[PDB]
Design a protein around this ligand. Structure first.
Ligand SMILES: [Fe+3]
Ligand SMILES: [Fe+3]
Ligand SMILES: [Fe+3]
Ligand SMILES: [Fe+3]
Ligand SMILES: [Fe+3]
Lengths: 158, 158, 156, 158, 158, 159
């Protein structure tokens, strides 16, 4: 009932929000001549959008009415000063994406909505991989950023 | 300078705003079982987003700062009652996209910004084709929907 | 005489090319893109016939002088695809009549090469009139129900 | 805009007019047994026609009403006595084609019609190549025609 | 236009001057064992000369008389001591190449010379890419050069 | 030592000078509608620049300091008025390219610079080929131009 439809709508918005945040990260990367890191964020921006579209398609099939919400402007990009700040906001965004999916999953569970739970399972497994991957990149960036110039090698060896 | 940089920014928002409205058209069609029309709207939705990414890429290369704005909630979907209403809204959306590109070209012309005018040319020719295509679909849809059920065998066919 | 009719056959073919072009424009402006592509194809083909007549005339020492190709005027009167296909039928019947007058003059002159040259065009006019006749019948039938004709432009 | 639409129509007429002039040049060549020159004129005839069709197609898309005019009879073919006279009328025809496009571009520039200007760009560049190719052919014809019979080998070697 | 002709000639000189400057940069790189950077300057040297040849070809077709000027001895090589200095001079070279294209386009616009402006459009867009790329290399160079030896390890690589 | 380093730099400048002279010839040919001859001159312009690049690369490897000089504006185009004039200036350019190579070789030989001499050998042989080729085209051009229009036939035909 109500809470479930609402959370499924919010999930769509969270996916497109995340897509815009990834695009703001590619912009900061490009503007500061980190083309490899910018290419990476641009691909994640397309992927998040694809996840949003996948939820909209399932909702349409399941008669969960979707209504598209505004997609908020990304906010972190005004205060980024180094690749480490960007990859840190990106880790947080993925932690927020994981929480969003777990909130939706908990509502489906309370409702015994077994179809919604089955649908969510590959996304739960994807978030595990995604958080791991971004955590790992952030570790490399924070270690390499200890020697002036050395991080430019991570980007170049794309 | 000021005017041009801000209108270029705003163009990115218009492209993503059109993407979202196409997406809302695609949902209304899917919810009302016009899968053929929904797939067309969904393809234009991706394409509008690629235009916005092409504007972002150019602005990065030309050091035009991009600040990504909220993408507004689509609103015409509350009023849509038939395919005709949707296509008519999609026609007004493309006419606004075209006006928005002409405004930007007018500012570039004023600033003598030859690079920006060159970048915009293929978009002006593409809006010519888009408005014609949408006008034509709308004419078809409005003719066919004069007989009950007949429009439903166009979605299924084309 | 014969030489005059041959010259005028060239003008008839290029006139018909232009009328088919005017029909293609009416269809496109009115969002019948499948009928417009068919008219446009016929427009190229009528000009090809005109060029076939020119080439033969040159080979045969028949002096070709190119005349004005008149502005199509039926376009001003067309309101539905039926009107356009009706004008195209009439254009083809005209095309047929001008070939037959030409063949008639060649026959009176015992001009066996001209007559042999015309033979494939006489047979092609029979096919063309039948095909237009048949499209016009289909158009007239489908247009009895609102929107239905549209559904068959698109299935083209 | 009166002006723009009238000049757009005239541009269509000029393309079909040039197509008929090339056809008259092909006929004079063939009648005087210059088959290689005749083939070249015939190719240019079909091409000028294709240009006219491209203008019609764009006009239709952009809702510029086209009303086909009479295609006037070629007149130069009564006074040509040699290949030189033909290639000279054909140079003049291409100079007139260029001037007509330039008229149309001026009108479009005055209206700020960026779509029309963009559409004409490849034609402006094609006219540059056309005038130079015709001009060079004419120079070769004029030089070789100084020796009786020698021009008849330009033709054979084409 | 005297102005338009003089500026078209100066564009040709500027392309071949930039070609020599890039060649001077390759020589400086090779003498100091930066073989990768040297290969890059040599590739640009060739491509600058190709641009010059493209302007010459258009001029000849458009009957703009080209008179070839002295190509000046490159002088910055006297002051370069590190790769950063070379890349900085190359950025300024490309900003001057953009500025000379812009002076040309300005005079073409003034004369309403639509074919010249069509001709320059791809070059405007290429100058955007070129200034962005060199800026981006120069950022990478200035950053890596902060640690002794680090720059070397990335000429060897990229 | 010094003369050898100077002459090696002069040889680079000479290659680029010849490249620009061939380019001026291609321009005069195109402006005068000899597109065959123009394409030939243009291909020679690029090849002369490749020779110049060849000398630069060798000089860098061998620690011969190269200072790039101005490439002077081509001068003969101002007075050319038939393809014969152009081809004769090109013959003279190639004869001058040959002499500068022989001077350079001479200097290399006095210095016992065996590596420089080795490097120059394929260019000496190339020049023999080039003078013969330009001299042969010039003979054909001068013969055919005795009949009005005839030379035009062999721009179109040959090249
Ligand atoms: Fe993700
Ligand atoms: Fe669109
Ligand atoms: Fe027919
Ligand atoms: Fe033409
Ligand atoms: Fe460059």
């Amino acid at each position: 009932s109500e809470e479930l439809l609402d959370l499924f709508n919010r999930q769509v918005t969270q996916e497109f929000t995340a897509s815009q945040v990834y695009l703001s990260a590619s912009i900061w990367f490009d503007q500061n001549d980190w083309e490899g890191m910018a290419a990476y964020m641009l691909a994640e921006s397309a992927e998040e959008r694809e996840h949003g579209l996948g939820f909209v398609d399932f909702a349409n099939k399941r008669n969960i009415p979707i209504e598209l919400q505004a997609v908020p402007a990304p906010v972190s990009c005004a205060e980024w000063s180094s690749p480490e700040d960007v990859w840190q906001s990106i880790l947080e965004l993925e932690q927020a994406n994981t929480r969003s999916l777990l909130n939706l999953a908990e509502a489906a569970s309370t409702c015994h909505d077994f179809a919604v739970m089955a649908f969510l399972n590959p996304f739960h497994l994807q978030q595990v991989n995604e958080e791991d991957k971004i955590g790992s990149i952030l570790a490399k960036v924070t270690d390499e950023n200890r020697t002036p110039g050395l991080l430019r090698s991570l980007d170049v060896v794309s």
